[PDB]
mmCIF file of C-alpha atoms and ligand atoms in Angstrom:
data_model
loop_
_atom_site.group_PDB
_atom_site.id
_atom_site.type_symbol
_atom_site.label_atom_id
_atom_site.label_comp_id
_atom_site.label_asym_id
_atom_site.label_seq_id
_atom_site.Cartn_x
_atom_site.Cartn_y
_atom_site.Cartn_z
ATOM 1 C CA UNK K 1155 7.837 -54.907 136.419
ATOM 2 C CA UNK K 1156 9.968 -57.260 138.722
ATOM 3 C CA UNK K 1157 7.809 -55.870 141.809
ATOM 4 C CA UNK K 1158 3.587 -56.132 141.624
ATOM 5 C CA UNK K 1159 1.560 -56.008 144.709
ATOM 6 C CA UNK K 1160 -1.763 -57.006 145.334
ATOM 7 C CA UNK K 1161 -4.372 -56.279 147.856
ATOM 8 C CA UNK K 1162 -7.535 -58.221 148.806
ATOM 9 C CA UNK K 1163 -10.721 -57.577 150.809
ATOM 10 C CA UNK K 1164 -11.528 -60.472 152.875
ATOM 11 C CA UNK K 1165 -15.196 -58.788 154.303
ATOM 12 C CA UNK K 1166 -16.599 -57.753 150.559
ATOM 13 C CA UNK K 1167 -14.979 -60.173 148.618
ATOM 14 C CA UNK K 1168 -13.257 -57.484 146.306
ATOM 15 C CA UNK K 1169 -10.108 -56.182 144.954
ATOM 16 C CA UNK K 1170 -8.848 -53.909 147.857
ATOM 17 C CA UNK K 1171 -8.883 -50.369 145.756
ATOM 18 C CA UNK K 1172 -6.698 -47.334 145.946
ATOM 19 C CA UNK K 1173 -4.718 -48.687 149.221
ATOM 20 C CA UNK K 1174 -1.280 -47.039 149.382
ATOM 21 C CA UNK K 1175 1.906 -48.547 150.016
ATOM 22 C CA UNK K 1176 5.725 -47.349 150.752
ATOM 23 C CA UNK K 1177 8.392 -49.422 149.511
ATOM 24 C CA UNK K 1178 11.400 -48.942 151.566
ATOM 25 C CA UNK K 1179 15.172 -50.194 151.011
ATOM 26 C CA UNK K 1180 17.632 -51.242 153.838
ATOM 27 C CA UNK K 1181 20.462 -48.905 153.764
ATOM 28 C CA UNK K 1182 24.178 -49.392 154.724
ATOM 29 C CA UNK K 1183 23.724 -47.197 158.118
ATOM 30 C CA UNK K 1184 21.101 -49.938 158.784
ATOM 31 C CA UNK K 1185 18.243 -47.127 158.196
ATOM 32 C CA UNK K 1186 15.174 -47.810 155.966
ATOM 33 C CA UNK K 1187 15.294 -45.740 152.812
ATOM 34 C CA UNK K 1188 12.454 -44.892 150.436
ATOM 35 C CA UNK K 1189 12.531 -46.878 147.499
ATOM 36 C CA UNK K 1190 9.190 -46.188 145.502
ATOM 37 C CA UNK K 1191 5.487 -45.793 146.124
ATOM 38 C CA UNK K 1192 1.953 -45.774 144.915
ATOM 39 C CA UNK K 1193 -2.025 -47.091 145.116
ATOM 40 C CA UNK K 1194 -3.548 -50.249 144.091
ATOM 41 C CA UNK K 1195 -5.806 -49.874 141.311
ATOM 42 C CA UNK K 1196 -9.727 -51.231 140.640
ATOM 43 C CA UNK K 1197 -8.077 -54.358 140.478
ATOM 44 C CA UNK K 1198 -6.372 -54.169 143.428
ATOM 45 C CA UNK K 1199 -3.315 -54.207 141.786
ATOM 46 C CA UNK K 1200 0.104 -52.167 142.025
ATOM 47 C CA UNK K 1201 2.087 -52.169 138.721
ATOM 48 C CA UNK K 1202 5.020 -50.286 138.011
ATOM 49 C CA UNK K 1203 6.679 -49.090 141.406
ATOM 50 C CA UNK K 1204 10.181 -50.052 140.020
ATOM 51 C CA UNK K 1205 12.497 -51.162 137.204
ATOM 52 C CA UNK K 1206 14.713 -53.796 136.528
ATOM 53 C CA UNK K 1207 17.797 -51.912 136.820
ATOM 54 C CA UNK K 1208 16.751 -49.412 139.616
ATOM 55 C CA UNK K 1209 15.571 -52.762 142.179
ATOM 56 C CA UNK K 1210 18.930 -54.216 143.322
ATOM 57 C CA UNK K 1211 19.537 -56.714 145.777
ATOM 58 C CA UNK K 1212 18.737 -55.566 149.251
ATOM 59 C CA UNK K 1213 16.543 -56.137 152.098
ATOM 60 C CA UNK K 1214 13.084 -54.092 151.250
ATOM 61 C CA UNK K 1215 9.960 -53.530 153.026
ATOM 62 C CA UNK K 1216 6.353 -53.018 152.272
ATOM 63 C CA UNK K 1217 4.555 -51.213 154.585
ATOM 64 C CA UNK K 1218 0.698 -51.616 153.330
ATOM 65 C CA UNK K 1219 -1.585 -48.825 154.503
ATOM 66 C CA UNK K 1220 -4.342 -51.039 155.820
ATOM 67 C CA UNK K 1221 -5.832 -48.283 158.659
ATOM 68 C CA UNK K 1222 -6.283 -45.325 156.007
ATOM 69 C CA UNK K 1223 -8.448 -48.194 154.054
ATOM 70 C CA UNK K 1224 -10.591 -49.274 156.337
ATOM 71 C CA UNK K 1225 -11.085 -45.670 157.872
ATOM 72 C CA UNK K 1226 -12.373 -44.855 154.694
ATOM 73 C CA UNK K 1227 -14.797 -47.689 154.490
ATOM 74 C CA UNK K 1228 -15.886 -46.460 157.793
ATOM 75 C CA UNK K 1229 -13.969 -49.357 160.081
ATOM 76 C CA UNK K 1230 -11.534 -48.602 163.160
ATOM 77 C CA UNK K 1231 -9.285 -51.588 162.253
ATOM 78 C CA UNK K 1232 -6.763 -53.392 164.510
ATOM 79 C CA UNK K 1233 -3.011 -52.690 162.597
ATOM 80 C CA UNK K 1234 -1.498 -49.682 161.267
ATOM 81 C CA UNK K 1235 -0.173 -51.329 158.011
ATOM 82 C CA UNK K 1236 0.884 -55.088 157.175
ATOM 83 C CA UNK K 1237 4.709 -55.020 156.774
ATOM 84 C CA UNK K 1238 6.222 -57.667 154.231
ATOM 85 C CA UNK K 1239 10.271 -57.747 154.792
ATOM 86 C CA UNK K 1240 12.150 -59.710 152.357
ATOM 87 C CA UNK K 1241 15.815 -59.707 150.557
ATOM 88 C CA UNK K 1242 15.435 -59.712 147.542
ATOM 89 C CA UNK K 1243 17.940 -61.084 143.724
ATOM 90 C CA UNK K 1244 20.296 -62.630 146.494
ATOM 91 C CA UNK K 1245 20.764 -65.037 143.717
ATOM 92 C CA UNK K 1246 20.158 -62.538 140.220
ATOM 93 C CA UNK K 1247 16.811 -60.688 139.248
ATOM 94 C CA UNK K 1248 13.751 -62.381 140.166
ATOM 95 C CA UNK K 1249 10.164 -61.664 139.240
ATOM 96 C CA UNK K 1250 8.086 -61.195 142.714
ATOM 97 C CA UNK K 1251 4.612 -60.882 143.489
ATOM 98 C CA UNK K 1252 3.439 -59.719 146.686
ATOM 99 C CA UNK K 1253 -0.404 -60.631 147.980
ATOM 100 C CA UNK K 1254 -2.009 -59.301 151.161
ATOM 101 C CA UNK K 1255 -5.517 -60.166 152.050
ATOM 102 C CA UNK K 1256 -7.347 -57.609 154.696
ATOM 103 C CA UNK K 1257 -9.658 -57.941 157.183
ATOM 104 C CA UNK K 1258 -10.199 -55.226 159.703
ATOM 105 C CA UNK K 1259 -8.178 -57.724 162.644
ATOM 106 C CA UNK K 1260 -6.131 -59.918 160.520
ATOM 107 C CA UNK K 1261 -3.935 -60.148 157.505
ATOM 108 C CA UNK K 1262 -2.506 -62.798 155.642
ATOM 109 C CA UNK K 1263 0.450 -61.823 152.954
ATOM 110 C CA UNK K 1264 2.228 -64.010 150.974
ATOM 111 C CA UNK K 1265 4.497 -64.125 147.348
ATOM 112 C CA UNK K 1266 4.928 -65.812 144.592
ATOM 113 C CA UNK K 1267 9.043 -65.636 142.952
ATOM 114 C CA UNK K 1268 9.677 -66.386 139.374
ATOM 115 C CA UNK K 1269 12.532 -66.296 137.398
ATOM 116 C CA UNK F 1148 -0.462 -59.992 181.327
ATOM 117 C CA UNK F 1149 -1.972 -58.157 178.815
ATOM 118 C CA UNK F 1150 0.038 -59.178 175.567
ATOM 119 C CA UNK F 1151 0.581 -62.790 174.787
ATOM 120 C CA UNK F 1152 2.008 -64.010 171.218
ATOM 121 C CA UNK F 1153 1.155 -67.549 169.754
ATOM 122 C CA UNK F 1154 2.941 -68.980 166.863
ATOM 123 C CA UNK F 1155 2.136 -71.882 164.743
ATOM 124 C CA UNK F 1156 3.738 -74.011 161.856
ATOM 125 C CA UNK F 1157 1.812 -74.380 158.700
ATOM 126 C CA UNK F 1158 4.157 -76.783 157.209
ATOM 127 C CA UNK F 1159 4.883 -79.027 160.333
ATOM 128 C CA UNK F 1160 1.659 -78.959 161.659
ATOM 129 C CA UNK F 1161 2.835 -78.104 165.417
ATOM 130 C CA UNK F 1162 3.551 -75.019 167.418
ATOM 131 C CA UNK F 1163 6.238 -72.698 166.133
ATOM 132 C CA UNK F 1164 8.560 -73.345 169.362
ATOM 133 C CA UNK F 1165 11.590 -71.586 170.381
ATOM 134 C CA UNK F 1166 10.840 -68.643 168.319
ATOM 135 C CA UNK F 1167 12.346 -65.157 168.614
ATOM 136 C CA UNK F 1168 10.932 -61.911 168.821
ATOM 137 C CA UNK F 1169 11.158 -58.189 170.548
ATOM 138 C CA UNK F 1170 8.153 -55.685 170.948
ATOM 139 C CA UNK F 1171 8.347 -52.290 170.189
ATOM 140 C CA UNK F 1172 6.446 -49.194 171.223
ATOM 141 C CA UNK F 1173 6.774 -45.545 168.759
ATOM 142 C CA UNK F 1174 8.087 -43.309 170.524
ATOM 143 C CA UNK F 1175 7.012 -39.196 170.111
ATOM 144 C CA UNK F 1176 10.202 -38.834 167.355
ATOM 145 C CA UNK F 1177 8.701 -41.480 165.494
ATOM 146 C CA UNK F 1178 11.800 -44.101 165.970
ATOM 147 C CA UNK F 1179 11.045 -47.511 167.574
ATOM 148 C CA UNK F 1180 11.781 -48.247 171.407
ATOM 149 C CA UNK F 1181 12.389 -51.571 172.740
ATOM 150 C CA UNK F 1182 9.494 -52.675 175.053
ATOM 151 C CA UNK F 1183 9.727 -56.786 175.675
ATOM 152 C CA UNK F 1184 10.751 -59.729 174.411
ATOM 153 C CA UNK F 1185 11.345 -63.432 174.803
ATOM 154 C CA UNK F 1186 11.234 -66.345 173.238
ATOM 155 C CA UNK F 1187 8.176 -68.793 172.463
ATOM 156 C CA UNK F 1188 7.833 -72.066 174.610
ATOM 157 C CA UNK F 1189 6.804 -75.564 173.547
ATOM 158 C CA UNK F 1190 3.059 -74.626 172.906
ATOM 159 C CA UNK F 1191 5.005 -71.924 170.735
ATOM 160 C CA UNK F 1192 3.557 -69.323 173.242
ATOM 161 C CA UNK F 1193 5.047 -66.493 174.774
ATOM 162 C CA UNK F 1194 3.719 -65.355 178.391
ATOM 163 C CA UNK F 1195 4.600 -63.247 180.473
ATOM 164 C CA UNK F 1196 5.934 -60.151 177.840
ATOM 165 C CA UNK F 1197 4.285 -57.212 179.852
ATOM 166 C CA UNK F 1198 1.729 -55.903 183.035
ATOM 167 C CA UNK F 1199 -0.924 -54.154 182.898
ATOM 168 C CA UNK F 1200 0.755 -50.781 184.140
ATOM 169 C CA UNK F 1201 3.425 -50.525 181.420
ATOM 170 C CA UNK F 1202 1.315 -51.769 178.645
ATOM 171 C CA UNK F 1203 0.121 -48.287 177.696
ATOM 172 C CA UNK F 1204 -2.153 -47.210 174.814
ATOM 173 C CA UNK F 1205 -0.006 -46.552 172.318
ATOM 174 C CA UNK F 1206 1.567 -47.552 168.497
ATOM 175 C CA UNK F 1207 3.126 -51.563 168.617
ATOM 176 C CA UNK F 1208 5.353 -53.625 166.711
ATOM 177 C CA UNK F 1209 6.018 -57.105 167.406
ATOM 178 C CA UNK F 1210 8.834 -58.495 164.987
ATOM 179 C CA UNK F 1211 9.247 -62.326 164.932
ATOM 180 C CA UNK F 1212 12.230 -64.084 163.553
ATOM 181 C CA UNK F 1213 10.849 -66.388 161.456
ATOM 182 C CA UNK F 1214 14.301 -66.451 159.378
ATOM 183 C CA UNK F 1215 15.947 -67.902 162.228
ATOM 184 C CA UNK F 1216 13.045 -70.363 163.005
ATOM 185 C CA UNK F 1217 12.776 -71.816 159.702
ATOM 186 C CA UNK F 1218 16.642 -71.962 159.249
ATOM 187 C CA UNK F 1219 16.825 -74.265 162.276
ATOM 188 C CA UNK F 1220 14.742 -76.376 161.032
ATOM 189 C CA UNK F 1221 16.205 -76.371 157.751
ATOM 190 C CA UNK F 1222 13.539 -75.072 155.237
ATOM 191 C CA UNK F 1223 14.272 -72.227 153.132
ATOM 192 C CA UNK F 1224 12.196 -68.997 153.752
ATOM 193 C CA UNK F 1225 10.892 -66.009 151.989
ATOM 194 C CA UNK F 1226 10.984 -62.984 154.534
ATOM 195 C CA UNK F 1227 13.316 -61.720 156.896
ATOM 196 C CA UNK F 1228 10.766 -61.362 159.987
ATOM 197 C CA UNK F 1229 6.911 -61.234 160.095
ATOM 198 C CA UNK F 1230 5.403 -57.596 161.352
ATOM 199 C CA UNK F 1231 2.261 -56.963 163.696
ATOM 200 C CA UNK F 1232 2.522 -53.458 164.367
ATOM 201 C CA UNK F 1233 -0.913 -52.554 166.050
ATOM 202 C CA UNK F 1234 -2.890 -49.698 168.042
ATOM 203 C CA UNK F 1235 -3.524 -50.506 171.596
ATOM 204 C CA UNK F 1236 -6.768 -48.722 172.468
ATOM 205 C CA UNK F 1237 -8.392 -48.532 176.212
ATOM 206 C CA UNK F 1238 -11.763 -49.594 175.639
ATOM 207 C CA UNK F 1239 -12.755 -51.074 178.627
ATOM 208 C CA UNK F 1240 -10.428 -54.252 180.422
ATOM 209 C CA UNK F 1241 -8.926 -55.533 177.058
ATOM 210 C CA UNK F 1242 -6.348 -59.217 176.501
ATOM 211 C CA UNK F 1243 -4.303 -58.773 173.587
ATOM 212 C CA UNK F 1244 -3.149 -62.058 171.445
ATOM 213 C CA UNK F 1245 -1.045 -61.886 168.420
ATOM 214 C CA UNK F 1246 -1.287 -65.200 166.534
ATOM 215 C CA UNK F 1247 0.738 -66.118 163.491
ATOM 216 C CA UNK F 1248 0.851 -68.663 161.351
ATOM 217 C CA UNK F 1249 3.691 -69.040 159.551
ATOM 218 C CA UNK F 1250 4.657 -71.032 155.960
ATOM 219 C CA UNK F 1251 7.820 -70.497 154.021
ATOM 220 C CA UNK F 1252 6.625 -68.018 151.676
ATOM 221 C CA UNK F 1253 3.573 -66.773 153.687
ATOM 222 C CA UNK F 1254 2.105 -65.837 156.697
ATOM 223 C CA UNK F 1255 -0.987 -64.785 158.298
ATOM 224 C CA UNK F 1256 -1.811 -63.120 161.508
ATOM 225 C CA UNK F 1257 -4.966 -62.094 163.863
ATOM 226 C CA UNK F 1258 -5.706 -60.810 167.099
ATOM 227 C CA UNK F 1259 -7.933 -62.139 169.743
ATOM 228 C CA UNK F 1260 -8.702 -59.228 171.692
ATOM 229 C CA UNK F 1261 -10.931 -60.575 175.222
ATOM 230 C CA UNK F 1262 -12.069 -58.833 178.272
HETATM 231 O O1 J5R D 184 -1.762 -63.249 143.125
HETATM 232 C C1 J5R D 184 -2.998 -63.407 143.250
HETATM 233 O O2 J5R D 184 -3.766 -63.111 142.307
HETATM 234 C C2 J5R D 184 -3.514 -63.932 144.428
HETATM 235 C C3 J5R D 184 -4.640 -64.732 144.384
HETATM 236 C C4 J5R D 184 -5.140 -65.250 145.569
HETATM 237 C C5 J5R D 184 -4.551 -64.997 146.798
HETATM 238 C C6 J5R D 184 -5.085 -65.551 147.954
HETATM 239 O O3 J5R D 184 -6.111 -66.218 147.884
HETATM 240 C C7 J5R D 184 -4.434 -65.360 149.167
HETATM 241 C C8 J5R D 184 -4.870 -65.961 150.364
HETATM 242 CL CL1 J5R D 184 -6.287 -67.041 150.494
HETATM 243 C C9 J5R D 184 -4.171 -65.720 151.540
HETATM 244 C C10 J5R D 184 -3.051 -64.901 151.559
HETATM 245 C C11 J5R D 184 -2.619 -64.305 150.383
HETATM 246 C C12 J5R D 184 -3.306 -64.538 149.199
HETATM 247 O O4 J5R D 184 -2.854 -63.949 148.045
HETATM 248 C C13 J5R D 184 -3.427 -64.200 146.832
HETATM 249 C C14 J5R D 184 -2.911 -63.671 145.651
HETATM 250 O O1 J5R D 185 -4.755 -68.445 169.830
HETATM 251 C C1 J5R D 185 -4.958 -69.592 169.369
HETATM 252 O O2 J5R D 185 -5.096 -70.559 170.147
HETATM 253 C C2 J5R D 185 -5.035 -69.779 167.991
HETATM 254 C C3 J5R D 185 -5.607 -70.920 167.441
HETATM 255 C C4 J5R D 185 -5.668 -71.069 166.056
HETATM 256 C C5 J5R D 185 -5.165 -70.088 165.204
HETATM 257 C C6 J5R D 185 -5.233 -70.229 163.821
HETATM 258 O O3 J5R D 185 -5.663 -71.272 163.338
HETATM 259 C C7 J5R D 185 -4.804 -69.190 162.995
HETATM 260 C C8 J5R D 185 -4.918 -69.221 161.587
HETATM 261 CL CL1 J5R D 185 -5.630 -70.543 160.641
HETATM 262 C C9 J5R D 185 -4.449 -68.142 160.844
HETATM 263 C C10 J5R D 185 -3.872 -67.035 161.448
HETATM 264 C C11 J5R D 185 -3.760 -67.003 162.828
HETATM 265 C C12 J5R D 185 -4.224 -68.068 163.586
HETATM 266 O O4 J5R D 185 -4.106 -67.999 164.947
HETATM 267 C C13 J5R D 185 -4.599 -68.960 165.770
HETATM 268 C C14 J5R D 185 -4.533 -68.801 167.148
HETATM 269 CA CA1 CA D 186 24.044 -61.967 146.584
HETATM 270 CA CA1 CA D 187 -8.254 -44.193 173.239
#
């Protein structure tokens, strides 16, 4: 898949586990369209929201839900989801991994682009 | 004021100066209504954003341009803006700071919330 994201949890020390996520795609009226969607895994892991010929160049956005996970581990949390904006194959297909790393009143996100 | 943004530079190892960014608070349709913004000053802090009467509880987004700030400076970056979209909650007399910390490919962010 040329789009993986990965959640961490930065109070337990563990993968971050069935957090969802909404992966939206800029649009030409400037609105944010929905692009594809799912839940991290028992590794924390999201594999397979797209394919190679369906994830064109654009500007997307990830919009973690961070709040609905830490409701669930009992914790009122600070944000309502960590947002990662990016444009993505400006320059052909590229390979991109997408980290975020929780705690209930911080994030940190970052990725990792290979060709 | 209530709200007060900080913004550092994790490759530079300064303050993240003359950065961009606007404030939004969700509105009842769910779309995104201007609030405040400014600009952040040579200790890469912005003062001054809000008062205490029109700083409701309510859904927040601040969106920084880090695009812009790292283009001036000439280093190529990964997203288009970084996203702190938050809950403001009355619990008794509450200071809200947004920090950031900002690399080309990554950023983290906390809140300091004070009485
Ligand atoms: O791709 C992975 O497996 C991976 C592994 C480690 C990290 C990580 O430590 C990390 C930290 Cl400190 C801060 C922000 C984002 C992060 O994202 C990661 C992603
Ligand atoms: O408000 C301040 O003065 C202040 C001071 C230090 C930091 C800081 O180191 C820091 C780090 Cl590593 C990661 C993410 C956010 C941060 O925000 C800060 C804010
Ligand atoms: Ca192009
Ligand atoms: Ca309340």
């Amino acid at each position: 898949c040329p789009l993986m994201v990965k959640v961490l949890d930065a109070v337990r020390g563990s993968p971050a586990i069935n957090v969802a996520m909404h992966v939206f795609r800029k649009a030409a009226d400037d609105t944010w369209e929905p692009f594809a969607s799912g839940k991290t895994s028992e590794s924390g892991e999201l594999h397979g929201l797209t394919t190679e010929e369906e994830f064109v160049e654009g500007i997307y956005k990830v919009e973690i839900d961070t709040k609905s996970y830490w409701k669930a581990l009992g914790i009122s949390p600070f944000h309502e989801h960590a947002e990662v904006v990016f444009t993505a194959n400006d320059s052909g297909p590229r390979r991109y991994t997408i980290a975020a790393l929780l705690s209930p009143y911080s994030y940190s996100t970052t990725a990792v682009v290979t060709n």
